[PDB]
A paper describes a structure:
The mtEXO complex is composed of two subunits: the nucleotide triphosphate (NTP)-dependent RNA helicase Suv3 and the 3′-to-5′ exoribonuclease Dss13. Dss1 individually has low RNase activity, and the robust nucleolytic activity of the entire degradosome complex nearly completely depends on ATP, an unprecedented feature that is not found in other known RNA-degrading systems. To understand the structure and mechanism of the yeast mitochondrial RNA degradosome, we present crystal structures of Dss1 nuclease and the mtEXO complex of the yeast Candida glabrata (Cg).
We then designed several deletion constructs and obtained stable preparations of the Cg-Dss1 protein with a deletion of 69 N-terminal residues (Cg-Dss170–900). We also introduced an inactivating point substitution (D477N) in the active site of the RNB domain to prevent RNA degradation during crystallization. We obtained crystals of this variant of Cg-Dss1 (Cg-Dss170–900 D477N) that belonged to space group P 1 and diffracted X-rays to 2.7 Å resolution at a synchrotron source. Two copies of the protein molecule were present in the asymmetric unit. In summary, the structure of Dss1 shows that it is a special member of the RNase II family in which N-terminal domains - β-barrel, WH and HTH replace the typically observed CSD1 and CSD2. At the N-terminus a β-barrel domain is present (residues 92–170 of Cg-Dss1) with a patch of positively charged residues facing the RNA-binding channel. The second domain that is unique to Dss1 is a double HTH domain (residues 320–419 in Cg-Dss1). The catalytic domain of Cg-Dss1 is very similar to the RNB domains of the other RNase II family members and can be superimposed on them with an RMSD between 1.6 and 2.0 Å.
Residue numbers in the entry: 89 to 155, 190 to 257, 260 to 272, 275 to 432, 434 to 452, 455 to 655, 658 to 830, 832 to 867, ...
RNA sequence: AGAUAC
């Protein structure tokens, strides 16, 4: 065991024996020595080289290496020491490689990510002496050769991480993202030498010369409120403030000091902690009157198009057209229900039912077929991907949905063509058909032998929204044909039994009330700048739609496995938990069978025992949805995993050579999981920004629920009324509260929206 | 933190 397989990360959860890097101890190795014991305290116990323990949140783990009292302490310590030693020895050599291959990976035009693993492999497999010979070809040989085994050397891994954190300080690499489920790094940006490293070197130089004269000249202009000259003269400083508020340079400490000096020289801002919000306030103050300014949108990793690389790609997307334009089953005038919101972009799904008997119904799930618009759907002559629009699409591994804006994974042209829901238009689908039988027990049974996958056509699309459907199933609405209206009631009654089945039979875990309140929508102004809040609805139509997609996705799992097809699955492992905690958890899991579903107060206590879901190149149980594999196909225009599962289908159904061998898959799943993580983050970050910006506009008291153990006399908390208003409370020393506890009257200390900071007193 | 849709 000198190397390990990245796959054991997916197969395993955090467990004792794991060797970790913590956010606390980024420069010392640690090792998990105990798991959480209760809901009262859900932290893991880690041991340092010194035998000193550390208790930390599962998510404080930045990277993970999978697996007589004194002997145990001794072997724990000597192990950690050995790994550190061999790690340190490589490090001066690794820094040299990092600077070097940074020359080959960099793109001159903007930030560009790379799989962190692929990167580690290059570090290991590279000879500096051969790379410097006047016969480059070598380096490119090592990079392509990174694809093979796929095993990874832990010490090189550790050293590379350390090397990157070091060269991060020179604006050579972006942040290292650590996936929540695997607890391991996924990707890191490679920032351009001239546009970021070098630019900020010249900035620092020009600002410190003649004892910070230009800092001084600038701060004067600000105090004299002459914003005009700032524009002509000091735009490089606006840039700097911008890169701080957006979160691009928040890790370069020189620049933070520079910024401290500037605030120190400005009257209003002089005494205040240097926070992105504060850079935002200033930058707003010295820039022409806007209506809103979400600066998170400037973030390089969020990677919205602004000049750059993505600005190049959208120049293609704007003029791209799916001229790839044949043996499909036609469903005729059979009606297809596309139950989406009024404010929807991509219509990926439709439902059709045929009532055959009182006992039996046949179901058709018509998924848009974006895979069809590309030569790769059918072309067995060329292995891999030749197409521009397709490579780009897979790079934007999902559509980016934010309260501010949306960035579709696919071009507008391809979306109009592939979209469902266009009435009386012959519309290509991929359709999954099967039959359900009502069972004697009142239950329901699914005939997998009915299950069928076909390339179809549909054209009869009833106009429907989750609301219209709901008012229909209440009787409020009767604008629909009685034949159509009854297919809905039938579908709704089928889902109810599907859901009841998933709970009692698949031991699925399904959430109750309160879980998605105060979500964020922008409203426009006298410009989308007004936040309005809502709850995600759990209704008859959502229940209907959801139950079927879940089922569709479960079945393609079965299909891909039985036919030995490489697919992108979505998995969920859960946590390794202490025996007393596993009972606190299990006690809640029987409550869902019995009829009570968990409250968010109840979930807060449980939330300290949950994992997150992750994509995988091979089947693993998604242990929430049920006890079985799960492969997402229902949203091929907005999820890359689904989109890839479709190209495999096109190949298979036309009995062609498949598009992807299993090896090409692991590379993409890494690419996808990376982009998935970034998006979860920036979704939370922006909505938080807006939750807080509203709490600012609204003006001192609110009720909260405790969500953490006191660390330095302070707890984490959340607002029941708002999902993205998470803060910290300074506990009153006069008295300690448990997790899930409510505190009704609380004083607001500070609010920093661009930073996500919310502070309170009791 | 799970799920669906977007
Ligand atoms: Mg829909």
């Amino acid at each position: 065991k000198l190397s390990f397989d990245p796959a054991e990360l997916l197969r395993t959860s955090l467990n004792v024996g794991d060797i970790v890097l913590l956010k606390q101890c980024t420069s010392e190795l640690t090792m998990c020595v105990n798991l959480p014991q209760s809901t009262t305290d859900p932290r893991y116990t880690f041991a340092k080289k010194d035998g000193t323990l550390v208790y930390a949140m599962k998510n404080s783990v930045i990277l993970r290496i999978p697996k007589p009292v004194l002997t145990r302490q001794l072997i724990v310590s000597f192990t950690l020491a050995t790994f550190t030693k061999f790690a340190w020895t490589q490090l001066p050599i690794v820094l040299k490689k990092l600077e070097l291959i940074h020359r080959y990976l960099q793109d001159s035009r903007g930030s560009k990510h790379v799989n962190f693993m692929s990167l580690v492999r290059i570090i290991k497999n590279l000879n500096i002496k051969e790379a410097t010979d006047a016969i480059d070809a070598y380096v490119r040989k090592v990079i392509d050769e990174s694809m093979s085994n796929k095993s990874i050397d832990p010490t090189t891994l550790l050293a590379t991480y350390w090397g990157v954190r070091e060269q991060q300080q020179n604006n050579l690499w972006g942040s290292v993202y650590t996936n929540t489920a695997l607890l391991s790094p996924t990707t890191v940006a490679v920032l351009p030498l001239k546009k970021a490293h070098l630019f900020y070197q010249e900035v620092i130089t020009r600002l410190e010369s003649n004892d910070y004269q230009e800092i001084k000249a600038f701060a004067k202009l600000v105090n004299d409120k002459d914003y005009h000259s700032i524009a002509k003269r000091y735009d490089y400083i606006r840039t700097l403030l911008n890169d701080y508020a957006a979160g691009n340079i928040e890790e370069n400490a020189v620049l933070t000091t520079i910024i401290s000096k500037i605030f120190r020289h400005i009257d209003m801002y002089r005494d205040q902690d240097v926070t992105r919000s504060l850079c935002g306030k200033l930058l707003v103050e010295i820039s022409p009157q806007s209506n809103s300014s979400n600066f998170i949108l400037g973030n390089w990793d969020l990677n919205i198009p602004k000049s750059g690389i993505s600005s190049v790609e959208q120049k293609l997307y704007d003029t791209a057209m799916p001229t790839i334009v044949t043996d499909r089953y036609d469903f005729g005038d059979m009606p297809v229900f596309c139950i989406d919101s009024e404010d929807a972009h991509e219509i990926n799904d439709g439902i059709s039912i045929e009532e055959l008997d009182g006992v039996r119904s046949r179901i058709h799930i018509h998924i848009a077929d974006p895979a069809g618009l590309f030569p790769e759907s059918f072309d067995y002559t060329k292995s891999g991907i030749s197409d521009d629009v397709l490579r780009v699409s897979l790079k934007r591994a999902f559509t980016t949905y934010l309260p501010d804006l949306v960035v579709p994974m696919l071009p507008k042209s391809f979306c109009n063509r592939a979209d469902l829901g266009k009435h009386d238009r012959k519309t290509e689908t991929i359709s999954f058909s099967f039959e359900l039988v009502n069972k004697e027990d009142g239950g329901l049974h699914v005939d997998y032998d009915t299950f069928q996958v076909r390339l179809g056509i549909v054209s009869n699309f009833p106009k429907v929204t989750y609301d219209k459907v709901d008012s229909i199933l209440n009787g409020d609405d009767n604008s629909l044909p009685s034949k159509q209206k009854k297919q809905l009631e039938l579908l709704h009654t089928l889902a109810t039994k599907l859901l009841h089945k998933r709970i009692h039979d698949d031991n699925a875990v399904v959430f109750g009330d309160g879980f998605n309140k105060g979500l964020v929508s922008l409203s426009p102004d006298d410009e989308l700048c007004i936040p309005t809040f809502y709850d995600q609805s759990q209704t008859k139509s959502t229940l209907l739609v959801s139950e079927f997609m879940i089922l569709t996705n479960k079945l393609c799992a079965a299909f891909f496995q039985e036919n030995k097809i490489p697919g992108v699955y979505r998995c969920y492992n859960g946590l390794n938990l202490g025996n007393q905690a596993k009972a606190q958890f299990e006690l809640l899991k029987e409550n869902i069978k019995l009829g009570k579903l968990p409250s968010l107060k109840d979930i807060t206590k449980i939330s300290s025992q949950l994992s997150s879901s992750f994509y995988s190149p091979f089947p693993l149980p998604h242990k929430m949805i049920g006890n079985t594999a799960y492969l997402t196909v229902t949203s091929p225009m907005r999820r890359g995993p689904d989109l890839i599962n479709h190209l495999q289908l096109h190949r298979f159904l036309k009995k062609l050579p498949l598009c992807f061998k299993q090896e090409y898959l692991d590379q993409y799943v890494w690419s996808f999981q990376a982009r998935a993580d970034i998006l979860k983050i920036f979704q939370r970050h922006s909505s938080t920004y807006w939750t807080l910006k509203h709490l600012e506009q609204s003006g001192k008291t609110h009720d909260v629920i405790v969500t953490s153990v006191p660390q330095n006399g302070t707890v984490n908390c959340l607002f029941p009324e708002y999902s993205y208003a998470r803060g910290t409370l300074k506990l009153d020393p006069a008295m300690i509260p448990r997790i899930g506890d409510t505190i009704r009257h609380c004083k607001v200390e500070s609010i920093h929206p661009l930073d996500g900071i919310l502070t309170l007193t009791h």
